[PDB]
Amino acid sequence: RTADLERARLGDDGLDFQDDAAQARAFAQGVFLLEIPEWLDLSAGDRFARQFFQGTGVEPYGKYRDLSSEHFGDELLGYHSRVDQLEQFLLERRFWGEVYPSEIATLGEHLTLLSHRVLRSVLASAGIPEEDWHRASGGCSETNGSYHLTFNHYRSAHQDIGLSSHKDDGFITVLRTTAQGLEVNRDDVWEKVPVDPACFVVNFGLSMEILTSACVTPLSAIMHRVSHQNFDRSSFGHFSSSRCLPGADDGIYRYLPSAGLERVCGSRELIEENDHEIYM
Numbered sequence: 053r054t055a056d057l058e059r060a061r062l063g064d065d066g067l068d069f070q071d072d073a074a075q076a077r078a079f080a081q082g083v084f085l086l087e088i089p090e091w092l093d094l095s096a097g098d099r100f101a102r103q104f105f106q107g108t109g110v111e112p113y114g115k116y117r118d119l120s121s122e123h124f125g126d127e128l129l130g131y132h133s134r135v136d137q138l139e140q141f142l143l144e145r146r147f148w149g150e151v152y153p154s155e156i157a158t159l160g161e162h163l164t165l166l167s168h169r170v171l172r173s174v175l176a177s178a179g180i181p182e183e184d185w186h187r188a189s190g191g192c193s194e195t196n197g198s199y200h201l202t203f204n205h206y207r208s209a210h211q212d213i214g215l216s217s218h219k220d221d222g223f224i225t226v227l228r229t230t231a232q233g234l235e236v237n238r239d240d241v242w243e244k245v246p247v248d249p250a251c252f253v254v255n256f257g258l259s260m261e262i263l264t265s266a267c268v269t270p271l272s273a274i275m276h277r278v279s280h281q282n283f284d285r286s287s288f289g290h291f292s293s294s295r296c297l298p299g300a301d302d303g304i305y306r307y308l309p310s311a312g313l314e315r316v317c318g319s320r321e322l323i324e325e326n327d328h329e330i331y332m
């Protein structure tokens with residue numbers, strides 16, 4: 053089974069689906085395809101995902117395997133071997149300019165502003181007053197959220213699922229994938245996400261679900277996984293969360309229609325609990 057996802061594009065007015073019914077389905081499912089801008093170069097990011105795990109013998113990106121949690125004072129960051137086939141390199145935007153290769157930081161900045169534009173179209177369709185967007189999004193309705201540019205490599209030799217079923221933590225994930233393996237559970241059936249290297253996959257995360265859970269049309273965080281890989285696979289994604297710095301956490305809120313925002317938990321708190329459940 054392959055999912056029939058709606059396709060969108062970023063245009064002069066924001067997210068453009070084929071019509072209003074198509075936007076409504078896409079937002080209800082919590083997953084759709086987004087056309088990649090023709091000027092946007094993804095080849096350095098593609099190369100980074102193929103290389104980051106390989107060590108200093110492999111140029112220019114293999115040396116990032118050596119950067120663990122500890123070099124960043126944030127357990128979330130650096131190279132992480134997961135219990136699934138997946139291994140990752142995760143870096144939050146405050147470190148991009150200093151730590152990533154300059155062309156990788158550039159990529160992360162393009163994706164941040166693209167995701168920013170995507171998120172603002174979603175918030176407008178949710179009927180949340182604009183003056184509440186910054187607090188409801190922990191800064192992602194502007195450019196003051198926390199942003200992780202995360203690179204993924206699936207070790208086909210590991211006898212695990214590729215990546216366990218899960219929801220992402222945040223508001224928006226912009227996923228770059230060029231090979232089969234991603235599956236989504238929109239209703240109660242698992243379905244393959246069709247591969248289209250001209251489109252990103254756009255997902256909503258748990259924060260979008262929490263934020264809109266009391267709205268007239270709640271938006272859901274899509275349950276997704278990566279099936280066991282028999283050959284290697286790589287990908288990367290840009291993740292937007294309520295600002296979750298150590299000691300400067302914007303928090304997670306739900307919107308109560310006609311009332312305002314009610315605090316639910318911390319952003320880092322939600323990330324830690326989610327990561328814990330994904331991998332145990």
Ligand SMILES: C[C@@H](CCO)[C@@H]1NC(=O)/C(=C/[C@@](C)(O)CO)NC1=O
Pocket residue numbers: 128140142200201202218219220221222291293323327330
């Ligand atoms: C906030 C960071 C996660 C920090 O750990 C961000 N949000 C996610 O939900 C996530 C999911 C996984 C499955 O890739 C983690 O393995 N990736 C990310 O980059």
Ligand SMILES: O=C(O)CCC(=O)C(=O)O
Pocket residue numbers: 202204215220227229233234276277278286287288289
């Ligand atoms: O590699 C993929 O296609 C999905 C990765 C993912 O879902 C994640 O890291 O959150």
Ligand SMILES: [Cl-]
Pocket residue numbers: 124125126298
């Ligand atoms: Cl830090």
Ligand SMILES: [Cl-]
Pocket residue numbers: 133139207
């Ligand atoms: Cl390894």
Ligand SMILES: [Fe+2]
Pocket residue numbers: 218219220276
């Ligand atoms: Fe995910």
